[PDB]
Amino acid sequence: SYTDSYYKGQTALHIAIERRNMTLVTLLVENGADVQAAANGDFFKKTKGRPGFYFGELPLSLAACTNQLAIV
Amino acid sequence: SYTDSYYKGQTALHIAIERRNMTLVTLLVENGADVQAAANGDFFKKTKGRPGFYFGELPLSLAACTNQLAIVKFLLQNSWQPADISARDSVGNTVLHALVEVADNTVDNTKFVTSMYNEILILGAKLHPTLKLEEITNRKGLTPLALAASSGKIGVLAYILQREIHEPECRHLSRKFTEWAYGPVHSSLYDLSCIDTCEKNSVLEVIAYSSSETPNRHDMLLVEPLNRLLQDKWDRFVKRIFYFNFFVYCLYMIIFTAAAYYRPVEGLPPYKLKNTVGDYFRVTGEILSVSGGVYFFFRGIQYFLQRRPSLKSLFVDSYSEILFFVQSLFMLVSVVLYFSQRKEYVASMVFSLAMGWTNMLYYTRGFQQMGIYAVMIEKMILRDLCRFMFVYLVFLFGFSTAVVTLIEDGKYNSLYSTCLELFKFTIGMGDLEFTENYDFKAVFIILLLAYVILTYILLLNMLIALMGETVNKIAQESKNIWKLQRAITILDTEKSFLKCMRKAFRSGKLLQVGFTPDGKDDYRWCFRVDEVNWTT
Amino acid sequence: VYLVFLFGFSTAVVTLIEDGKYNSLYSTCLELFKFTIGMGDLEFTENYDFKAVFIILLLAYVILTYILLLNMLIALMGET
Ligand SMILES: C=C(C)[C@]12C[C@@H](C)[C@@]34O[C@](Cc5ccccc5)(O[C@@H]1[C@@H]3C=C(COC(=O)Cc1ccc(O)c(OC)c1)C[C@]1(O)C(=O)C(C)=C[C@@H]41)O2
Ligand SMILES: CCCCCCCCCCCCCCCC(=O)O[C@H](COC(=O)CCCCCC)COP(=O)(O)OCCN
Ligand SMILES: CCCCCCCCCCCCCCCC(=O)O[C@H](COC(=O)CCCCCC)COP(=O)(O)OCCN
């Protein structure tokens, strides 16, 4: 996962869910990918004076937030 | 070609291109027709008080302007007589300047002009990869971008600043570079070149020092890269320097007030010092006050030389510099009378002192909430009182002369005291005490009551209603007004800067593309912006 | 805004006058405040020096504060 101060904890599954790739999500979960990682960098936390995207830091919350019921 | 003063230089090719007749254009160009003729009659030049059609005087510009892409391609790409994409007219305008000028900020026109602009750029890149059309300046020194900003072309400006061409081999024509995107967020780099550091005439200078007649003067600062730039410059350096200047002005005015209050009351200036503490503090304050006056005098002169404002718009813009300059003039006249041994220097000094306090309202602008009061006061003085002054003076001089003629030997047999009394009646603090027993008392009473009804009741409330609508008109325009004033402050702070510092740039001199048409790389002073958009 | 105007003209007037009822910041600030709300005097029966400058200053104050600023406040309050 990303180790920097901004994208900390982001992994492949978050990108796959964001990109709306059902197949890659299935492949990652099949290969033992963690479905309960926390993506908890400054880009992903609640904030007012900064651009960002808060979603709850978890792939399940991300899939729900982006309106992808099938992945949920 | 036409030989008269109106259609001078027009030829068949111009008519054919206007007629959208591809066949005639093909025939004429085939027969050796000059594709770089100049049509430079009065019908074809830039003009304000005359109907006309300016297009840049050349067939290529005409073909682009009328939305005939095919003829542009044919003129540039046919071998019989190729057209010079870089040609300039008498004004110095290239085709891109011509396209900028014939914008009008409507949806359909913006689509037409923007599209033709972009296609001309692609054709230029393919035909002449070593040519940079957008840097070519017309006779006023303006590039197409500077010209678009100058004329208030919001659509063309918003297009150019946010230009992104998703095509290989011509990405160097882009200015916006989307580095990445997430759900609602995306990050791009903006080119920034000749926005802030241009060395001829940058975008922000042109928007700020526009003449207040440009239609979209405030809207042009809402376009994304500019707004973020101004916010960054404000938060980094300009904010602290602004507060420091305001504090120093406050100290200056306190010193001036204290120096003025404790003036000596004996006769015949200049006044010699005594070896005492009070005189040393007083003369110290006097020296500092006069120094400040000299400083404002020279700043005003530098302003009027650098800007060269015309008489018509002298007050419409530059109101603040005028008032600061007039304050300094009162100070200098006071010094001249002081050493010239006249007590009447006091009469000058107090005026400067009064003005010195009210010019504090200059510093309220640049605040979102408080700048509205300074803006309103400026506009009400310049438009409502100044128009109303003539109407009120007609009434005042009429009834004053009537009353003074009627009266023989009273307090009303003098134009000065009579004008004072009627003025007081206008603002509701007269008397109407008819205790005197002069002749023509009935006529005197009828005249005064007619005056009081006409001026206190009718005219004054008319003025107040008009001022009320002016106040309501610009209550809702507050945000725009604030933004523009903050921009002007930032530019002036960069101009003076008083510390040998020229850290006017925002982000680094980073490689943008690295792939020119040739084997070099471009470093362009890009600026990173991450935006949020909740669409879908 | 109002205090900027008031302190400006109050200090100017007090500096101009030597030994009157206007040679005091307290009474002068009171008088100019009364002028703002339309219950002053404008009685120039006194015969001190610089009478013309005193008159011009007070009339400029009365136009700027009683006519211009006060009705600006009233228009804004009316919209609220
Ligand atoms: C040169 C001009 C235009 C001007 C200079 C003087 C004489 C002025 O009166 C006027 C004429 C006048 C006189 C009396 C009532 C209304 C207008 O308007 C201004 C000018 C107008 C004002 C009005 O008060 C202000 O709010 C000043 C001001 C407004 C907005 C600003 O952005 C500002 O920043 C510099 C200053 C202040 C005076 O300069 C002042 O302090 C005195 C003693 C008279 C006012 O002449
Ligand atoms: C709001 C919009 C509508 C406004 C309507 C206006 C109404 C104003 C009220 C009337 C005011 C009358 C003024 C007082 C009359 C007066 O006191 O004076 C009269 C002299 O004649 C006049 O002035 C004629 C009256 C003026 C004509 C009319 C404008 C008689 O003389 P004496 O003083 O010696 O009285 C004898 C000794 N005590
Ligand atoms: C509604 C918006 C438009 C507003 C327009 C404003 C018009 C107001 C006109 C009022 C003018 C009042 C003139 C004062 C005359 C006066 O009373 O003072 C004179 C000296 O004149 C001056 O003050 C200088 C001129 C002042 C000019 C000031 C603009 C000396 O007379 P005495 O003392 O010897 O009187 C001897 C017997 N008592």
Swiss-Prot record, chain A:
Source taxon at top rank: Eukaryota
ANK repeats: 11-36
Location in the cell: Postsynaptic cell membrane; Cell projection, Dendritic spine membrane; Cell membrane
Effect of residue 7 to A: Strongly reduces affinity for ATP
Posttranslational modification: Phosphorylation by CAMKII seems to regulate binding to vanilloids. Phosphorylated and modulated by PRKCE, PRKCM and probably PRKCZ. Dephosphorylation by calcineurin seems to lead to receptor desensitization and phosphorylation by CAMKII recovers activity.
Tissue expr: Predominantly expressed in trigeminal and dorsal root sensory ganglia. Expressed also in hippocampus, cortex, cerebellum, olfactory bulb, mesencephalon and hindbrain. High expression in the cell bodies and dendrites of neurons in the hippocampus and in the cortex. In the brain detected also in astrocytes and pericytes (at protein level). Isoform 1 and isoform 3 are expressed in brain and peripheral blood mononuclear cells.
Binding site for ATP: 7-10, 18-19
Function, in words: Non-selective calcium permeant cation channel involved in detection of noxious chemical and thermal stimuli. Seems to mediate proton influx and may be involved in intracellular acidosis in nociceptive neurons. Involved in mediation of inflammatory pain and hyperalgesia. Sensitized by a phosphatidylinositol second messenger system activated by receptor tyrosine kinases, which involves PKC isozymes and PCL. Activation by vanilloids, like capsaicin, and temperatures higher than 42 degrees Celsius.
Extra remark beyond the main annotation: Responses evoked by capsaicin, but not by low pH and heat, can be antagonized by capsazepine.
Domain notes: The association domain (AD) is necessary for self-association.
Family, as annotated: Belongs to the transient receptor (TC 1.A.4) family. TrpV subfamily. TRPV1 sub-subfamily.
The protein's name: Transient receptor potential cation channel subfamily V member 1
Organism: Rattus norvegicus (Rat)
Gene name of the encoded protein: Trpv1
From Swiss-Prot, chain B:
Function: Non-selective calcium permeant cation channel involved in detection of noxious chemical and thermal stimuli. Seems to mediate proton influx and may be involved in intracellular acidosis in nociceptive neurons. Involved in mediation of inflammatory pain and hyperalgesia. Sensitized by a phosphatidylinositol second messenger system activated by receptor tyrosine kinases, which involves PKC isozymes and PCL. Activation by vanilloids, like capsaicin, and temperatures higher than 42 degrees Celsius.
Effect of residue 429 to Y: Slightly modifies channel permeability
Effect of residue 358 to I: Reduces sensitivity to capsaicin 10-fold; no effect on sensitivity to resiniferatoxin. Reduces binding to resiniferatoxin
Membrane-spanning residues: 241-261, 280-305, 319-339, 344-364, 380-407, 443-471
Encoding gene, per UniProt annotation: Trpv1
Intramembrane bits: 412-434
Residues with PTM Phosphothreonine: 178, 489
Modified residue annotations for Phosphoserine: 310
Catalytic activity, as annotated: Ca(2+)(in) = Ca(2+)(out); Mg(2+)(in) = Mg(2+)(out); Na(+)(in) = Na(+)(out); K(+)(in) = K(+)(out)
Ligand binding (Na(+) 2): 428
Membership in a protein family: Belongs to the transient receptor (TC 1.A.4) family. TrpV subfamily. TRPV1 sub-subfamily.
Activity modulation comment: Channel activity is activated via the interaction with PIRT and phosphatidylinositol 4,5-bisphosphate (PIP2). Both PIRT and PIP2 are required to activate channel activity. The channel is sensitized by ATP binding. Repeated stimulation with capsaicin gives rise to progressively smaller responses, due to desensitization. This desensitization is triggered by the influx of calcium ions and is inhibited by elevated ATP levels. Ca(2+) and CALM displace ATP from its binding site and trigger a conformation change that leads to a closed, desensitized channel.
All ranges on the Extracellular side of the membrane: 262-279, 340-343, 435-442
Binding residues for Na(+) 1: 428
Binding, Ca(2+): 431
Cytoplasmic side: 306-318, 365-379
Predominant subcellular localization, coarse grouping: membrane
Motif (Selectivity filter) on chain: 428-431
Record-given protein name: Transient receptor potential cation channel subfamily V member 1
Record region (AD): 469-497
Originating organism: Rattus norvegicus
The ANK repeat ranges on this chain: 11-36, 57-84, 93-129, 143-166, 201-223
Curated annotation (Swiss-Prot), chain C:
Source organism of this protein record: Rattus norvegicus
Annotated Na(+) 2 binding sites: 38
Domain notes: The association domain (AD) is necessary for self-association.
Name of the gene encoding the protein in the UniProt record: Trpv1
Stated name of the protein: Transient receptor potential cation channel subfamily V member 1
Parent sequence residues shown: 583 to 685 of 838
Extracellular compartment residues: 45-52
Location(s), subcellular: Postsynaptic cell membrane; Cell projection, Dendritic spine membrane; Cell membrane
Stretches that traverse the bilayer: 1-17, 53-80
Tissue: Predominantly expressed in trigeminal and dorsal root sensory ganglia. Expressed also in hippocampus, cortex, cerebellum, olfactory bulb, mesencephalon and hindbrain. High expression in the cell bodies and dendrites of neurons in the hippocampus and in the cortex. In the brain detected also in astrocytes and pericytes (at protein level). Isoform 1 and isoform 3 are expressed in brain and peripheral blood mononuclear cells.
